[PDB]
Design a protein around this ligand. Structure first.
Ligand code: ATP
Ligand code: ATP
Ligand code: K
Ligand code: K
Ligand code: K
Ligand code: K
Ligand code: K
Ligand code: K
Ligand code: K
Ligand code: K
Ligand code: K
Ligand code: K
Ligand code: K
Ligand code: K
Ligand code: K
Ligand code: K
Ligand code: K
Ligand code: K
Ligand code: K
Ligand code: K
Ligand code: K
Ligand code: K
Ligand code: K
Ligand code: K
Ligand code: K
Ligand code: K
Ligand code: K
Ligand code: K
Ligand code: K
Ligand code: K
Ligand code: K
Ligand code: K
Ligand code: K
Ligand code: K
Ligand code: K
Ligand code: K
Ligand code: K
Ligand code: K
Ligand code: MG
Ligand code: MG
Ligand code: MG
Ligand code: MG
Ligand code: MG
Ligand code: MG
Ligand code: MG
Ligand code: MG
Ligand code: MG
Ligand code: MG
Ligand code: MG
Ligand code: MG
Ligand code: MG
Ligand code: MG
Ligand code: MG
Ligand code: MG
Ligand code: MG
Ligand code: MG
Ligand code: MG
Ligand code: MG
Ligand code: MG
Ligand code: MG
Ligand code: MG
Ligand code: MG
Ligand code: MG
Ligand code: MG
Ligand code: MG
Ligand code: MG
Ligand code: MG
Ligand code: MG
Ligand code: MG
Ligand code: ZN
Lengths: 48, 534
RNA sequence: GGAGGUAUGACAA
RNA sequence: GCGGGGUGGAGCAGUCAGGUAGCUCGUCGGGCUCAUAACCCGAAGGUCGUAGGUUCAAAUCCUGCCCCCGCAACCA
RNA sequence: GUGGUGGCGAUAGCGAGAAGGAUACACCUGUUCCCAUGCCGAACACAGAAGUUAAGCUUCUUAGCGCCGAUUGUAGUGAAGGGUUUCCCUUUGUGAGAGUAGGACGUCGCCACG
RNA sequence: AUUGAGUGUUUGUACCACAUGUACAGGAUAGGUAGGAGCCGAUGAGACCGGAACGCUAGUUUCGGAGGAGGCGCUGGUGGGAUACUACCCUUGUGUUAUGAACCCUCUAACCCGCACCACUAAUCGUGGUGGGAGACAGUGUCAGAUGGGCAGUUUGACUGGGGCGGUCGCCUCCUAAAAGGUAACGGAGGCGCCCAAAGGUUCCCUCAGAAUGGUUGGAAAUCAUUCGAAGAGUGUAAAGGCAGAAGGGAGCUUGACUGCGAGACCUACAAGUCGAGCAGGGACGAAAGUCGGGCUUAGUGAUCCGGUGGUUCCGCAUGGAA
RNA sequence: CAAGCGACUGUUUAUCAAAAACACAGGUCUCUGCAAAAUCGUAAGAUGAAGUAUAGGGGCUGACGCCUGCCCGGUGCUGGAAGGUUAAGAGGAUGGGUUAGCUUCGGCGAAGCUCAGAAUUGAAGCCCCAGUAAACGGCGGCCGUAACUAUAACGGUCCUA
RNA sequence: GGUAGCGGAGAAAUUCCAAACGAACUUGGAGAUAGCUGGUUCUCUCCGAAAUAGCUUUAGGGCUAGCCUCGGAAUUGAGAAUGAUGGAGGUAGAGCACUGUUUGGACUAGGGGCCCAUCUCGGGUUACCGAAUUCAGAUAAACUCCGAAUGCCAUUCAUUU
RNA sequence: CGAAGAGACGGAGCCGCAGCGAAAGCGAGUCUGAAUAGGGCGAAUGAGUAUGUAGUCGUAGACCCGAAACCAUGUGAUCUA
RNA sequence: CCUGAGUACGGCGGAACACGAGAAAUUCCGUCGGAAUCCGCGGGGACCAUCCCGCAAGGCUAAAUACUCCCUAGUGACCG
RNA sequence: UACAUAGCUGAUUAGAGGUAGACGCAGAGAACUGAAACAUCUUAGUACCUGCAGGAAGAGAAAGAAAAUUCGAUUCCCUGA
């Protein structure tokens, strides 16, 4: 079951990214280091 | 207590889907569901330990007394008194308050305002939880369940499963709560102890939610029954007792089944006519016309046709011994054992099993039942005597506290054996209701009931001819218990069993019962009740 | 004692 | 072209909703009977039409192909 | 001469054969060192100089294969027509593929050691 | 709503009477808090006797009899709390009242009578009157659910070698397509409505399919070795074009499947679609050069309206807010 | 002389159909207790009837004779009504907006007003249960088998109300 | 004399309701709407199409673009024709070097029956069937080691326009 | 006011002279953006307005004629049931 | 002491307001419920506070506006 | 039916119909049509019907318009647009 997800910034809570994952292959929330345009810095981003 | 549009999905397997429930105050709600249904998860939502992915869960401001399904032993060396005392926040606040006094001396005129407010609240909070409890707890043990004071100074980890359940239940009461959330409060209790719990819960004036797989226990207390559905991922709340819930539920599923039947007949009728027109000659214009018109109705029917919920599959057990039992599977002769520093549990214990025999080790809580079984396997070395297993006897052990699973590893990793290939392991786990990627789940996230199935699967995969089972039906849903008992009855091997569940022993059909602590190898009969009375 | 009534199996020998 | 079907000797399940191949009658061997039928007890008989896929694993899901059966293959 | 490093469509390749090591290039000798093998110091990496030109490598011979390939003729075809018009023909320009004569066992640089 | 009386039964609520308070220790049945050195009694005290209730079985409470005057607390120790008595009350179970309601029936003055008699009166209308019936129902108003082809307004594609039946409807690749591009048919063939957390980025490294020969289980064919082998493999998924200076394969670290953008192009009726150097922010890998704004390339998609969720130095109908 | 259809006399498409169509007496079902059901009407008022279940309305059949089999799973109708579901209304716990007042940029926040509002209660209907076919309707397959052959009284099996 | 059109009446035919009744007649809304058919009236001069693409409940309608016309602005003249030069592109033809289709010859693993030997184990044969190989010879819209003529794009190029 | 006139008065109003931004708002700039960047729209690089006249369009029956029909008042049982 | 009660207003159902229930103020109709009253009441487009403006639930009222069957006197790049 | 009332007789008083096929207010209220179909919507609160008028009608003397600070019943015209 491949699904669309949003990656929220764990610092400022801005929903910065649209991406997708297969829930069967990635049960847990996808976490990535992505640039936050608000904070203008790379921050941990987590699926919300 | 109220929940709206509840949603919760751990990875790919979901628990609640648009579930709702409203519990009125002063309702003794009996929570029922198969293992994994999500009964424990509901309490975690109430305790705010978990957060719903979507929806709102509403809880009253009153203080909640929570009895966990698993005992929480923070450190192995914790004493029973320390464990019980942790129920009340008296000790925690004093440690904070003692530090506050230290800060007051260090700080002169900077933090005094903040410190003074914190000191005042702690004193007021401490008085609200009157510090006289130190004496009340000591006597709460006496009046509650006849908990001896020798246990009071003993490490909690060393207590028996039944004894631990008494302590945990007492701890909840010690906290003086306003709402009772009891998660299997009688999991290991014996018949006598269950009587006290039932009477207190009957008398308890406040709201009490009970998760229990004991139908008789619930029927005496429950006025409202909440059923957590495993297939619909919803919550339904009935008024009455367990039987009333079964009656209402069975009727509803019957009435739903009949609805789906009639909707299928109408779809088949249209389908049958559409096909008849489809295969008619192209020259029959009117029939071809009518065929297309009915094709439109057929499409609209198939799009409003309710799906029948897949009935939850029940466990299938086929336990067979690889080898054959002997006339003397196990020889115990003049075996004495005592835990260092405690009275001897039994002296010169000598019994002899016969083979393909149902051997019941009867007793009460904290009498040595689990110690005897641990003795046979080799966990405990006998202080005196000998225990001899015939070379033809293979032994499978089901421990009481589920100590045979690696919490860190997955389900498949736990069951991994040198004698079984991958697809063989998966097939049996599916027979135990672990389907597809449900076997890659960590054992640490499973419920106690689901873990019990993994332990049972390990016992089954051994194909041993002697089964040492210590309370096997514990943590199992009522349906799985009957399956367990029926299949063991047909087991073609020797069974050494311990069980405080009267129904389970009847299904197995015990032959000889060994009473404790007064060693009495006896033929099994309703005289078991006579020993229980005496 | 006596009397009216309340499954299948040839043909000849 | 539109449907329905291929599972033990025959007739059927299981197929939707993946894990373990059965039920009915029959066949064969042995019993019971003077004998036959009925009955009793044992055994045999299919890797699911066939070949690739999907999967940890398929009779099952997907696809093709060959067979068998009811329709149709043209209307003023 | 040899070793580096390039440009040019293999006309530079391939196969076969012959010669050479002074240096150089290699095989080569080891696993203490950095580093390495889903196992293996084979490789990669490092340290080394007893032996060897046997192979690679350079130079040389061979067109057997591969590659390159003129001219002529022909197919096709632009334009202009024609007939006996699914096709075919004439004129004018263009012009293959094939098959061949042949070419070719390279050429043009830069650097270093000789 | 018109629509008003009751009774009874069961219930919700609020007072009002009563009674209940025994953890262990402790004079022993201390329910909480405050005041408290005084309090009660011939307005007949203690003690005694009997009935009754509770009960944790210790005792506690209450009524009556006889008697006639005295008792309790403070002081004292126990305990978290110390006792008489009063007040404010909280748990517990009995009753009374104020009662909100559901039902039960009963009542009668509304309302109704295509019942009788009486009058207006020639009248089988009507309106009054009197009896009888019915009755707070019914009827009627408002609102709400169900039912409702009884009735009403409507919808019920298009392409198509007529129309129908069947097929088709958007996107991708090929042939047709006539060596730029484009190019039709109900022309000839196939795919798509995804997948991947690596099957993405980068750094480093690697080279295939088959065949021959030899070799335990081992078979045509599972793994191993040598040789041959220019691609006859692979490239997630159709085809074409491309790729073995890899775009194929392995490994380490990673998240550039980045944010703001964007000269200039391609395509194109429009709306869209496609490519893009380069600039800045902050990074990944790499020693560095440098590469990276997903994947060998080209399908994997849907305008607006209307809604959901998150953010926001925007607006906020006098003003501050809110909506 | 004989066959079809309709029992019959009647009726009908004025103006292309006179019939086998309609009607019919007879049959049957069902409704209707009288301010009947049914119908015209917003209503009043009427028809039904100055009738009263041997009467009146509606459906179907269609003289007469002999007869009218099986199926109540479905759909209707009828009855049931314990349970599930269900409107307005009633009830309003809690949550928002505002702000007297508190406030350690925070923020907190009584009353009143106000925007939403869950529990609980809530009829019929529906789901269910039974009956009902002169109600709507519906009334099957395959295999084997007899002293020639053919068929197959007979056997098997599946499906269905 | 009664029943009147959202109706009446109908022994029932869509039957009758003033000589056309699936719903009368009359007046009005009203100049209903008509992507349809028909019609649309003096002259000369200049220029002069299209019957295509895309989208469309779209297909005999419409919209934007293309093509016509009128006016205007402006540039290193951006258009057309021809020549020269340079490029992209895989068609005609041709070929087989790949992939399909295919003929004969040689030789052949392997494949069919027969006997001897059978534990079915090893042979000897139809000029028995023959993979693959090789020799020769064909064939192709969706084959290509090749490959034109033309057409096409371009040039501060040349000539005419 | 005046001949059913011209005209006079009447500056309310309308267009133009500034744009950019959803907006607060800034302004020859402005919006986006962290940005002195780039880019969008503007300014640079000015002509408008009133009236007449003609072409075309829009709202009106809108070039003219034509339905079957729909709706709302009325008139008809002197034919016929 | 008086200053318009079954009124204002509210729920429900409709309607009118350019405003189609919408965040819908303001006005009205049906139905049910239902205020305050000067220390009061209403409005300033949900709502609340503040401020400002007004004082409903009683009535009357010329002119500027619409139209012309008729009457009188005329007019027309109106018909003929 | 007791007093009454209703009824009944007379007198008194005032309506009763028509228009101007217009204009006004109110009750009730279409459809074709447009939306390139069509149910919201539109045609329209139009046509039609009915009541009541008056020479005009209706509205009208703030529980108003506002927030330049103020205006001071209504109606109608221009503008806002
Ligand atoms: N490790 C130990 N160390 C010290 N004492 C122990 C230990 N284990 C058990 N005991 C004591 O042994 C006594 C009985 O042992 P056991 O665990 O067998 O009880 P049980 O029969 O299983 O009772 P139940 O299962 O009903 O709770 C308990 O009182 C317990 O306190
Ligand atoms: N972190 C988690 N990750 C993955 N699955 C989870 C996680 N937590 C819970 N689950 C799943 O949630 C499901 C239901 O939750 P829960 O443990 O409350 O069931 P339960 O009814 O309480 O079990 P039981 O009645 O047997 O005690 C479990 O099957 C469990 O496997
Ligand atoms: K080496
Ligand atoms: K060499
Ligand atoms: K060469
Ligand atoms: K009533
Ligand atoms: K044709
Ligand atoms: K990688
Ligand atoms: K007839
Ligand atoms: K007849
Ligand atoms: K007959
Ligand atoms: K006749
Ligand atoms: K007829
Ligand atoms: K009959
Ligand atoms: K009848
Ligand atoms: K019938
Ligand atoms: K009849
Ligand atoms: K039936
Ligand atoms: K039925
Ligand atoms: K408030
Ligand atoms: K007639
Ligand atoms: K033009
Ligand atoms: K070839
Ligand atoms: K070709
Ligand atoms: K700019
Ligand atoms: K800028
Ligand atoms: K001008
Ligand atoms: K003009
Ligand atoms: K017109
Ligand atoms: K016009
Ligand atoms: K007549
Ligand atoms: K409104
Ligand atoms: K106002
Ligand atoms: K005001
Ligand atoms: K007039
Ligand atoms: K309409
Ligand atoms: K239209
Ligand atoms: K007036
Ligand atoms: Mg649990
Ligand atoms: Mg135990
Ligand atoms: Mg050539
Ligand atoms: Mg009557
Ligand atoms: Mg209709
Ligand atoms: Mg219409
Ligand atoms: Mg068509
Ligand atoms: Mg056709
Ligand atoms: Mg071309
Ligand atoms: Mg082309
Ligand atoms: Mg790849
Ligand atoms: Mg405001
Ligand atoms: Mg406002
Ligand atoms: Mg007749
Ligand atoms: Mg006749
Ligand atoms: Mg006729
Ligand atoms: Mg005739
Ligand atoms: Mg008939
Ligand atoms: Mg007809
Ligand atoms: Mg006529
Ligand atoms: Mg009109
Ligand atoms: Mg010309
Ligand atoms: Mg060709
Ligand atoms: Mg008439
Ligand atoms: Mg008449
Ligand atoms: Mg409106
Ligand atoms: Mg108001
Ligand atoms: Mg109201
Ligand atoms: Mg004022
Ligand atoms: Mg006036
Ligand atoms: Mg329309
Ligand atoms: Zn951030």
């Amino acid at each position: 079951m491949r699904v669309n997800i949003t990656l929220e910034c764990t610092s400022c809570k801005e929903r910065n990214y649209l991406t997708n994952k297969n829930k069967r292959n990635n049960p847990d929330r996808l976490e990535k280091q992505k640039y936050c345009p608000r904070e203008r810095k790379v921050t941990l981003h987590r699926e919300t | 207590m109220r929940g709206q549009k509840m949603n919760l999905t751990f990875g790919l397997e979901e628990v609640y889907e648009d579930a709702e429930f409203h519990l009125g105050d002063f309702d003794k709600v009996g929570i029922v569901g198969v293992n994994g249904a999500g009964k424990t998860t509901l309490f975690r939502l109430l305790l705010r330990e978990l957060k719903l992915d979507k929806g709102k869960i509403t809880i009253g401001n009153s203080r909640i007394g929570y009895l966990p399904q698993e005992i929480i032993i923070m450190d192995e060396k914790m004493t029973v008194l320390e464990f019980l005392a942790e129920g009340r926040p008296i000790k925690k606040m004093e440690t904070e308050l003692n530090y506050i006094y230290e800060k007051l001396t260090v700080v002169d005129d900077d933090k005094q305002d903040r410190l003074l407010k914190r000191m005042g609240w702690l004193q007021e909070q401490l008085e609200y939880f009157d510090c006289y409890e130190a004496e009340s707890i000591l006597l709460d043990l006496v009046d509650s369940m006849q908990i001896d004071f020798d246990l009071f100074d003993q490490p909690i980890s060393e207590l028996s499963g039944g004894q631990k359940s008494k302590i945990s239940f007492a701890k909840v009461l010690y906290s003086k709560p306003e709402i009772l959330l009891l998660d299997q409060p009688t999991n290991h209790l014996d018949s006598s102890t269950k009587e006290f719990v039932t009477k207190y819960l009957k008398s308890y004036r406040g709201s009490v939610l009970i998760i229990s797989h004991d139908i008789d226990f619930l029927n005496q207390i429950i006025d409202k029954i909440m059923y957590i559905d495993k297939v619909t991922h919803k919550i339904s709340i009935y008024e009455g007792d367990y039987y009333t819930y079964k009656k209402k539920y069975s009727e509803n599923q019957l009435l739903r089944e009949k609805m789906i039947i009639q909707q299928e007949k109408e779809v088949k009728e249209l389908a049958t006519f559409v096909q008849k027109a489809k295969q008619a000659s192209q020259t029959n214009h009117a029939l071809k016309r009518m065929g297309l018109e009915r094709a439109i109705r057929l499409d609209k029917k198939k799009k409003n046709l309710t799906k029948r919920d897949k009935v939850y599959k029940r466990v299938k057990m086929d336990i067979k011994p690889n080898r054959e039992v002997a006339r003397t599977p196990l020889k115990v002769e003049n075996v004495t054992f005592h835990y260092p520093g405690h009275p001897i549990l039994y002296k010169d214990l000598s019994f002899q099993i016969s083979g393909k025999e149902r051997f019941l080790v009867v007793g009460e809580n904290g009498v040595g039942k689990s110690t005897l079984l641990k003795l046979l396997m080799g966990i405990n070395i006998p202080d005196k005597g000998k225990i001899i297993f015939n070379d033809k006897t293979d032994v499978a052990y089901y421990s009481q506290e589920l100590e045979q699973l690696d919490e860190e590893k997955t389900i498949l990793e736990n069951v991994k054996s040198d004698e079984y290939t991958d697809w063989k392991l998966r097939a049996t786990l599916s027979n135990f209701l672990f389907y597809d990627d449900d076997v890659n789940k960590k054992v640490n996230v499973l419920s106690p009931g689901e873990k019990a199935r993994i332990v049972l699967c390990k016992v089954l995969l051994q194909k041993a001819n002697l089964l040492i089972l210590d309370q096997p039906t514990n943590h199992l849903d009522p349906e799985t218990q009957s399956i367990i008992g029926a299949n063991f009855n047909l087991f073609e091997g020797t069974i050494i069993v311990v069980s405080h569940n009267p129904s389970f022993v009847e299904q197995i059909g015990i032959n000889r019962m060994l009473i404790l602590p007064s060693g009495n190898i006896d033929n099994y009969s309703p005289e078991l009740l006579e020993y229980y009375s005496n």
